[PDB]
Amino acid sequence: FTLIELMIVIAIVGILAAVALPAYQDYTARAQVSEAILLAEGQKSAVTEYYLNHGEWPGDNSSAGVATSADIKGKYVQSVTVANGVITAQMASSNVNNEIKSKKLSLWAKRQNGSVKWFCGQPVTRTTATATDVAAANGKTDDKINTKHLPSTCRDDSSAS
Numbered sequence: 206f207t208l209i210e211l212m213i214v215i216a217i218v219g220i221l222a223a224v225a226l227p228a229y230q231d232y233t234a235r236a237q238v239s240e241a242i243l244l245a246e247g248q249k250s251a252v253t254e255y256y257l258n259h260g261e262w263p264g265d266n267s268s269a270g271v272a273t274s275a276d277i278k279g280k281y282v283q284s285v286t287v288a289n290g291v292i293t294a295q296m297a298s299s300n301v302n303n304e305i306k307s308k309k310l311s312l313w314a315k316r317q318n319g320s321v322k323w324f325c326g327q328p329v330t331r332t333t334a335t336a337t338d339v340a341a342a343n344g345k346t347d348d349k350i351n352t353k354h355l356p357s358t359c360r361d362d363s364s365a366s
């Protein structure tokens with residue numbers, strides 16, 4: 206070899222050092238959102254029990270049997286709220302992935318004739334406790350967890366049934 210080869214390998218070392226990284230933030234965000242998925246799944250039993258014994262979805266955390274929304278918190282989850290049978294888990298505002306800062310995801314259920322289908326994904330809103338349909342939460346600001354920061358199994362739409 207010669208000096209040109211050594212300069213070329215130095216340039217290649219620089220290329221490798223300054224190589225672009227994949228969107229590992231998305232995967233870390235998925236891992237952190239898994240915590241809120243588990244926390245929202247925790248309240249599924251209470252919400253389902255109230256719906257079965259009363260015929261209408263739990264309007265608030267109070268009659269769902271679950272604690273206050275601020276109390277249902279984890280390392281990366283700041284709140285898990287139940288609104289008309291829809292379990293919405295909100296991320297933390299700091300010490301979390303920047304992609305999922307202060308973002309929410311919903312875990313709602315639809316009662317079929319033979320089962321109670323459970324759907325997980327972007328935030329949804331049920332108007333009344335007796336309503337059998339859900340709709341997207343609101344535009345407002347970016348409170349929706351991006352679908353790339355959610356598991357592929359947790360990307361259900363508001364129209365899913």
Ligand SMILES: *[C@@H]1O[C@H](C)[C@@H](NC(C)=O)[C@H](O)[C@H]1NC(C)=O
Binds near residue numbers: 261263265267334
């Ligand atoms: C529990 O959620 C119910 C949906 C609600 N009923 C109505 C008609 O709003 C009820 O008031 C709640 N109970 C408590 C103790 O908050």
Ligand SMILES: *OP(=O)(O)OC[C@H](O)CO
Binds near residue numbers: 283286
């Ligand atoms: O009522 P909830 O437990 O959803 O908490 C309200 C507060 O503004 C942050 O969640």
